[PDB]
Amino acid sequence: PINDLRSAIALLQRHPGHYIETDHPVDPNAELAGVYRHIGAGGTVKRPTRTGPAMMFNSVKGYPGSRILVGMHASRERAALLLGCVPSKLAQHVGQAVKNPVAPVVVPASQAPCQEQVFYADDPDFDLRKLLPAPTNTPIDAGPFFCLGLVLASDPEDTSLTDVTIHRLCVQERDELSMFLAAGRHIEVFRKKAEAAGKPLPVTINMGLDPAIYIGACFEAPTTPFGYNELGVAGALRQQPVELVQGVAVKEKAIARAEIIIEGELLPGVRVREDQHTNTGHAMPEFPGYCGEANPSLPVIKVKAVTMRNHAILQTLVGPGEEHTTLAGLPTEASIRNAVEEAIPGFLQNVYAHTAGGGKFLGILQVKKRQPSDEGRQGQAALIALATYSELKNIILVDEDVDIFDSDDILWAMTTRMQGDVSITTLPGIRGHQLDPSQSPDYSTSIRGNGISCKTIFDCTVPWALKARFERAPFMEVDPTPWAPELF
Amino acid sequence: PINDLRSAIALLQRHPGHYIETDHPVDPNAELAGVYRHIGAGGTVKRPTRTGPAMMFNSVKGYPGSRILVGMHASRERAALLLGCVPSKLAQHVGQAVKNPVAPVVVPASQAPCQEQVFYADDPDFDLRKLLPAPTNTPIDAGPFFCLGLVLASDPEDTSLTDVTIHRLCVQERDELSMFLAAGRHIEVFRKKAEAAGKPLPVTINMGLDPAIYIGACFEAPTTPFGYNELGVAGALRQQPVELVQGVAVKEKAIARAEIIIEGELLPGVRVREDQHTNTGHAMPEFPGYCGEANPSLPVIKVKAVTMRNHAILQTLVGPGEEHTTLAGLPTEASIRNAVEEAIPGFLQNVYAHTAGGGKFLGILQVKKRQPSDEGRQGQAALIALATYSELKNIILVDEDVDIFDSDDILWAMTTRMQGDVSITTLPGIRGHQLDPSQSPDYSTSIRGNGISCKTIFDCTVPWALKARFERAPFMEVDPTPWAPELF
Ligand SMILES: Cc1cc2c3c(c1C)C(C)(C)CC=[N+]3c1c([nH]c(=O)[nH]c1=O)N2C[C@H](O)[C@H](O)[C@H](O)COP(=O)(O)O
Ligand SMILES: Cc1cc2c3c(c1C)C(C)(C)CC=[N+]3c1c([nH]c(=O)[nH]c1=O)N2C[C@H](O)[C@H](O)[C@H](O)COP(=O)(O)O
Ligand SMILES: [Mn+2]
Ligand SMILES: [Mn+2]
Ligand code: NA
Ligand code: NA
């Protein structure tokens, strides 16, 4: 029974290949991410790279007693194990959880291991940059980063409305972090409201969590509208409410069984340049695989306290690579699957938020045409996907005999089940995502501004009338195990 | 306080222009529809036609004491009057209704005006064809029709789940009607379960109702999925549970305040050709404005009793014209508005399921670009509309300074705010609707079968960067009343 990060690690150690440790000292500045690039980053990371074990660095140069874990979610197979289902059924499993959330509950401090140690920021010797290692991804990052900082915040007009979101946080001072909030983010709604009143917004930053919590948090509207506390998704995944705890220094709740907690306040009026201390002009790598530019004006979090377990693990990521694919892609699949199943019951067999799009840009939809009237519904399913997840860019439609998690098999369907002047539909001028650098007026005259795209639907499903001609060569059903037991 | 059809009529008489009566004899065979075609049929009806008053024919040739009402819903303004809001806010008023239904409530027979007269079909002289004047729309109809028959059935395995749907009913014998159910209709799921067990399914047909009941019943999935009693959308429009009565001859409930009830059972194994007595080859006019073909195999309702008020009004429609536009269009609008508001809050201003598409084929979306990032979201709204209502064919996008209910102003936006090689996106091969005769491989080589279409998005919104050049010419704001008092 997993209810925190260390019960999750215990599970991975029962499945060898999924978790390793090392005691060889590593520099959290750039070197750590450089090592894991070769070992488990995966995703859109610059080659050479691969998926591998989640990796724990026990010896962190400059931070004795600290230990850093990366890659916990950097594998679809690892994610399915931690959630307790088969990887091919994640879309259905996560889809049902978001439809039936279990609300979190408050517990006293006695059942909050996150509060075994309390460090107040008003101590003259407190220094966030000395207390926790904040690893960087590239040598040209804006500064030390926390990349799995699950921020928890509430509406200042109604404290029953809580939202939880991962945002990148750069360590700027002994007691300040910069926080990037994209436009339209739900916590940003809370922040703009507090700043409009000239008041700070209390926040907790929760790091080192049950993988169900990180995954469950990464939903967006309309699947989780404004007001939907995404912690309910984790509660449904575990059939156990997430436990919240009162922070020690801010008027906001914290995740009781987290490893590390930073309590702080979003200051009104204050803005800071993300790379003020390095002037690299860059923030950190983004999920499409390119380096993001430093943000010139970010709100800052004034740290009030840091609150940890004993021998606490600092969990972060590298790439963000395959870890981002899992965190964003599983909700993307769940959101799409729920929408298509509601509109066209029984039609959609599966969906893959492909790692080549970081779990956001590329959707592979697996459909099964059961009757003549299903012809023409494959394009409807693509439209539903595009309408459900506006940050999608391209859709590839395939039949139930194509393995959507095998990119070779996807390209096969694009080769023998596609005619370029028949099967490709382009939709110009649709708002997409700022971090796709090809979504620029410089790339296409049909793009009026940054983050607008042509979106393309590749229909690689066999036309209904031709299905008897496109049967894949049938090989005899055998159990191969007796001829090579070692390989099974 | 409107609880039924007579109270609804009473309100219309307080608004001159919306209700008229005639004592000049009329033949319910073809001639009645021929007259109302000129008076208020509207919609896709072949010109000359118009919207006008709801019309009560008090002298029905061959049926003394009967009186036929048509056109009750054949006007958006009249529907707005009957529901108590302004016509521009029906999309929002009905949208909030479907998302807050109020379940119906059972009532004893002493409070059921529908049962003031009872005619059991086991009487030797009972003849449905002499008892009620079921009018025909065209001389080539399959036979006499009831076109506002709200059929009420339930799951034979779960009595708790009840569905209500308008279906065209053709009087075939003295105690029999045929009923057409399209593929995947929700009541068809109940009948197929009944027929597969060799059991009849008891049903009640409710005619002459509060307009709120007819309108709220015409929703479709995924807005009102399978298992959603459409009764209660009416309950939300009236803030009043509609009242039910236990049937006098079948194990099913009827709407207590209806004008006429027909109690019957869908018979297992039996099928009839819809035009068996006419051999015209046609059923009746469909909502796109063409003649539907006679269905060769339809289930049969065996009438067990007919139950009606004193001086019962037979309510039906003609065209189906604008009456269908209202019944189908306002659920269409509510569904699209709810979906876009969930996905892009504040962006969509209004939506019109245009009468030229019968309330189903043509969607006019009125958006307001508020900021640079709203450029590219107009196409996203169009995708959401097409994903939400799969029977849509075309989308026209316009700004908030275009009156989407004025077809001249729509064509204006298509003339000065569109370039043909920029603003038009075509999506070939998407399933649409069988009753669009242009959705045929004979019309286009990209159409693989009947009811598949190219779907087209006309972006007639001003590009964000150009909005200052497209301001409509402003006139001094005056009160014109003193210069033309009689014109109000
Ligand atoms: C998984 C993930 C999501 C990040 C993210 C990261 C990851 C790993 C980082 C740490 C690698 C770097 C950037 N992140 C940010 C972010 N959203 C945002 O506004 N600012 C961010 O800095 N997101 C996206 C955000 O978490 C998702 O879009 C949420 O679904 C938004 O939820 P909301 O609707 O509640 O606001
Ligand atoms: C408003 C309206 C809807 C008709 C209709 C008519 C009208 C006036 C008529 C009476 C003029 C002619 C045909 N009707 C039929 C029809 N659907 C159907 O399956 N058979 C029909 O005969 N419909 C469509 C159907 O009622 C709607 O699509 C419902 O939303 C379906 O509801 P459901 O999902 O619960 O089955
Ligand atoms: Mn949210
Ligand atoms: Mn229904
Ligand atoms: Na969130
Ligand atoms: Na229905």
From TrEMBL, chains A, B:
Record InterPro entries = UbiD, UbiD-like_C, UbiD-like_N, UbiD_Rift_dom
Keyword hit for rRNA-binding: no
3-octaprenyl-4-hydroxybenzoate carboxy-lyase-like N-terminal domain residues are: 14-97
Q: Per the UniProt record, which residue ranges are transmembrane?
A: none
Residue ranges of every copy of the 3-octaprenyl-4-hydroxybenzoate carboxy-lyase-like Rift-related domain listed in the record: 107-319
Which PANTHER family does the UniProt entry name for this protein? 3-OCTAPRENYL-4-HYDROXYBENZOATE CARBOXY-LYASE-RELATED (PTHR30108), FERULIC ACID DECARBOXYLASE 1 (PTHR30108:SF17)
What cellular-component terms does GO give this entry? Answer: cytoplasm
Key words, A-Z: Decarboxylase, Lyase, Metal-binding
Q: In the record, what terms sit under GO molecular function?
A: carboxy-lyase activity; metal ion binding
- Xref: SUPFAM superfamilies: FMN-binding split barrel, UbiD C-terminal domain-like
**Binding of Mn(2+), residues:** 163, 186, 230
Q: Which residues form the 3-octaprenyl-4-hydroxybenzoate carboxy-lyase-like C-terminal domain?
A: 326-460
What protein am I looking at?
Answer: 3,4-dihydroxybenzoate decarboxylase
Keyword check for Lyase? yes
| Protein residues bound to prenylated FMN | 166-168, 180, 182, 185-186, 219-220
Pfam families according to UniProt? UbiD, UbiD_C, UbiD_N
